């Protein structure tokens, strides 16, 4: 039945279920046929398994529900079918990931839209206190970030180490996420627990466009860390000559 669900072989799946196959057979890894059909985007298999009594809330070894598998691969119709059958939209994995986190991780815009329409928590946090906006900033998905910010996600959410989505976008050279966050009221001078500004992070990583845009929008280059360390200190330490040159040409 697991193989039939993987390949969406409807006929042999119906035969197996009519000959007494367990629609809810959980192996040691916890991967039921419903998990497989939801992961593979097999809409008709998902409907068949749900009709034969597949459980909607079964967790894998890492506590993934079928909705987690559907949202991870951006299967909107499957996610809607599971939600209409009672799948918990706020179920969490071992790392505290809700399905909206999985959909944001995969740049699955329409899955994020559908989850938000079904009352998913837009500011749900993982164990590392990562919001879906944090995930979208980490992966560089500016479209997901636009959908989240337009729906009211907090642009200044703090992770465990005090990182905002702006900090994470500046770390990973995601300039579109950066402009989107700064367009929707993200603090350009927010500091982490270590006192790192977005300019600090960008100067340490050597992302020239981020540094240029941050200084053009009015970020002070003379901010200091917990140790008295300016962005010019970070640029010198990492040997980013161009970033340091643009800093020195500015008011650093």
């Amino acid at each position: 039945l697991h193989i039939a669900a993987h390949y969406e072989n409807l006929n042999v799946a119906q035969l197996l279920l009519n000959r007494g196959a367990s629609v809810n057979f959980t192996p040691q890894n916890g991967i039921t046929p419903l998990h497989i059909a939801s992961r593979r985007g097999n809409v008709i298999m998902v409907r068949l398994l749900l009709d034969r009594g597949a459980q909607i809330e079964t967790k894998t070894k890492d506590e993934l529900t079928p909705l987690h598998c559907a949202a991870r691969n951006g299967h909107v119709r499957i996610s809607e079918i599971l939600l209409d059958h009672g799948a918990p939209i706020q179920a969490k994995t071992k790392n505290g990931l809700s399905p909206i986190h999985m959909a944001a991780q995969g740049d699955h815009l329409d899955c994020v839209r559908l989850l938000l329409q079904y009352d998913a928590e837009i500011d749900d946090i993982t164990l590392d206190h990562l919001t879906p906006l944090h995930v979208a900033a980490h992966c560089g998905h500016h479209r997901v970030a636009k959908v989240l910010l337009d729906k009211g996600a907090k642009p200044n959410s703090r992770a465990l180490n005090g990182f905002t989505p702006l900090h994470i976008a500046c770390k990973k050279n995601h300039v579109r996420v950066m402009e989107l966050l700064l367009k929707t009221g993200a603090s350009i001078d927010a500091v982490t627990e270590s006192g790192l500004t977005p300019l600090h992070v960008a100067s340490f990583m050597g992302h020239l466009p981020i540094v240029k845009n941050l200084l053009q929008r009015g970020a002070s280059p003379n901010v200091s860390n917990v140790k008295v360390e300016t962005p010019l200190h970070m640029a010198a330490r990492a040997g980013h000559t161009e970033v340091a040159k643009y800093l020195l040409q500015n008011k650093a």
Binding site: V76, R77, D110, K183
Partner: protein
């Protein structure tokens, strides 16, 4: 697995015969003949053979049943138009299972004389794409005029010369027509819209845009332009003649001619050389825009402009819904990421081997209501120690979807002084009533801002594309409906314009709901009033049907909205 026949059931007077065809059979019209020894050939009948996405061994095999119905069986499609920040979904009747479409497609394919290659989906798709592009070039006229009824009447007009011709304002229908033909022949296909597409570069990653000192463009445009949107046909098949790993979605890219099938993965990874058209498709969604200021003296000065991103919000209809699916991640890596950096560097290396104190920030709404009102914000920051005397030029121009300018609408000239190291925000009202002329239909607004200061020789520039928002056509209909029973749909329209709606026509259609279409006249709607109108019709076809409503008036034309209804078979009785 080849041609074969076996008798399954038999009485004394008849044989029930099961006939197979090979998974790589030549498609088209077939004659079936029976040879009995001591007897001459007898024609049993005629049948048409098609590609089979349901068969594992077929080159067009689709893994998912839902994908099979969406990409081959669904005749009710959605073509996404508008801008990247305001996407408008227009209901489109692919109509690939209309009675004459299969004959028209096979007759068009008969122009290719390599009939032995008709068993190959790649060859059939290539030939049909080239022929349909040639027909589009021959039949689409230079610029109701834009009223559309799906791909089938367009195909009929292109093939026979009879019917309503399509005009160049809707040249994007080529993708939908190609999708219809491919779906009718059994090749799974979908229409893909790419917003901000850099067309006509010839593989170059640079786009030159030219603006005068008012922030407006004089000439009709360059050869290389960033189109507001471009449609394309994607088709699903294996690629036996390519290196392993390129099975899946293929882009049909005609070249002025001949057509090429490009795997989407090749575009994403910058595999320039796998097919001849990889370079052009890659440049369409990876080019960088360079803005030039055209002075009255004749100097062509370089401009400090905002980054104009290309290849945005690559969109197609979702599987099993009327929702919009974003597939940009199939075509590009995230901006500023490591993988995008590697792909860009490799492409630059291949092409090379083969061959300021002011900062402007422009905020605009994604859409401007028709005859409506909007606010735009210009942020100017001074990085100099001296206060700056700056001339801010604001320009609004009408542009067609293919980047060709239509009409200069508005211009504004501000003269401002900023204190040293002081941000200043200038809010400007963008009003329809201020336009020197009404924008042409199916055009978009090119908003520009140009800040020039003293004699620094460099000017700050920003641009945005603004869609025109029309009043929402609200359709209220039950989600489910019983076959052969009356079903009522109510349509609401709020007149948010500054003038009455006159000569008001409402048209309803939909396959399996209404035979052809019915056009009605409703009363004139004064400003801030609401049209409410009900239509009674009986669905006669079981399944997921779609009702399409179109409203025309003196203020706007071809305003279309849709709503889906599931028609169920009547309850079993005696």
């Amino acid at each position: 697995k080849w041609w074969s026949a076996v008798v399954e059931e038999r009485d004394a007077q008849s044989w029930t015969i099961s006939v197979t065809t090979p998974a790589d059979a030549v498609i088209g019209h077939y004659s079936l003949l029976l040879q009995v020894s001591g007897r001459k050939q007898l024609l049993l009948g005629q049948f048409t053979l098609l590609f089979n996405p349901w068969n594992r061994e077929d080159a067009v095999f689709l893994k998912n049943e839902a994908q099979r119905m969406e990409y081959l069986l669904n005749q009710n499609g959605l073509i996404y138009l508008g801008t990247a920040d305001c996407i408008q979904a227009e209901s489109w009747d692919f109509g690939q299972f209309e009675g004459d479409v299969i004959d028209l497609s096979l007759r068009l394919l008969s122009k290719d004389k390599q009939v032995e290659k008709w068993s190959q989906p790649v060859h059939v798709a290539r030939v049909l794409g080239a022929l349909l592009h040639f027909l589009k070039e021959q039949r689409v006229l230079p610029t109701l005029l834009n009223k559309r009824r799906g791909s089938v009447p367009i195909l009929r007009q292109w093939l026979t010369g009879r019917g309503r011709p399509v005009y160049d304002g809707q040249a994007w229908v080529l993708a939908a027509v190609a999708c219809t033909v491919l779906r009718c022949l059994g090749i799974p296909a979908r229409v893909v819209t790419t917003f901000a597409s850099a067309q006509g570069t010839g593989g170059r990653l640079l786009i030159d845009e030219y603006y005068n000192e008012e922030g407006l463009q004089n000439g009709e445009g360059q050869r290389g332009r960033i189109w507001i949107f471009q449609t394309s046909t994607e088709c699903w098949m294996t690629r036996p003649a390519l290196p392993q790993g390129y099975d899946g979605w293929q882009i049909l890219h005609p070249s002025a001619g001949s057509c090429d099938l490009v795997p989407v993965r090749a575009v994403k990874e910058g595999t320039l050389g796998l097919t001849p058209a990889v370079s052009d498709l890659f440049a369409a969604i990876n080019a960088s825009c360079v803005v030039w200021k055209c002075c009255e003296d004749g100097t062509l000065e370089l401009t400090d402009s905002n980054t104009k991103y290309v290849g945005n919000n690559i969109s197609t209809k979702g599987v099993g819904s009327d929702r919009c699916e974003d597939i940009t991640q199939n075509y590009k890596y995230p901006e500023g990421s490591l993988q995008e950096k590697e792909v860009l560097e490799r492409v630059e290396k291949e092409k090379m081997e083969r061959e300021s104190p002011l900062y402007l920030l422009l905020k605009a709404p994604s859409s401007l209501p028709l005859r409506g009102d909007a606010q735009i914000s210009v942020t100017l920051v001074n990085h100099s120690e001296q206060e700056k005397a700056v001339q801010l030029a604001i320009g609004v121009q009408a542009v067609h979807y293919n980047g060709v300018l239509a009409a200069k609408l508005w211009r504004k000239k501000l003269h401002l002084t900023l204190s040293a190291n002081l941000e200043k925000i200038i809010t400007i009202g963008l009003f329809f009533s201020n336009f020197e002329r009404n924008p042409p239909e199916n055009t978009f607004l090119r908003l520009t801002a140009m800040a020039t200061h003293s004699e620094s020789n460099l000017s700050c520039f920003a641009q945005e594309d603004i869609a025109i928002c029309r009043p929402h056509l609200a359709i209220k209909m039950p989600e489910k409906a019983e076959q052969y029973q009356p079903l009522t749909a109510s349509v609401s329209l709020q007149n948010s314009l500054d003038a009455p709606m006159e000569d008001c026509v409402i048209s309803i259609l939909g396959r399996g709901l209404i035979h052809r279409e019915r056009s009605y006249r409703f009363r004139s709607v004064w400003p801030e009033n609401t049209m409410c109108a009900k239509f009674q019709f009986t669905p006669t076809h079981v399944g997921l049907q779609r009702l399409t409503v179109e409203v025309d008036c003196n203020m706007f034309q071809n305003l279309t909205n849709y709503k889906s209804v599931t028609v169920v078979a009547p309850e079993l009785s005696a």
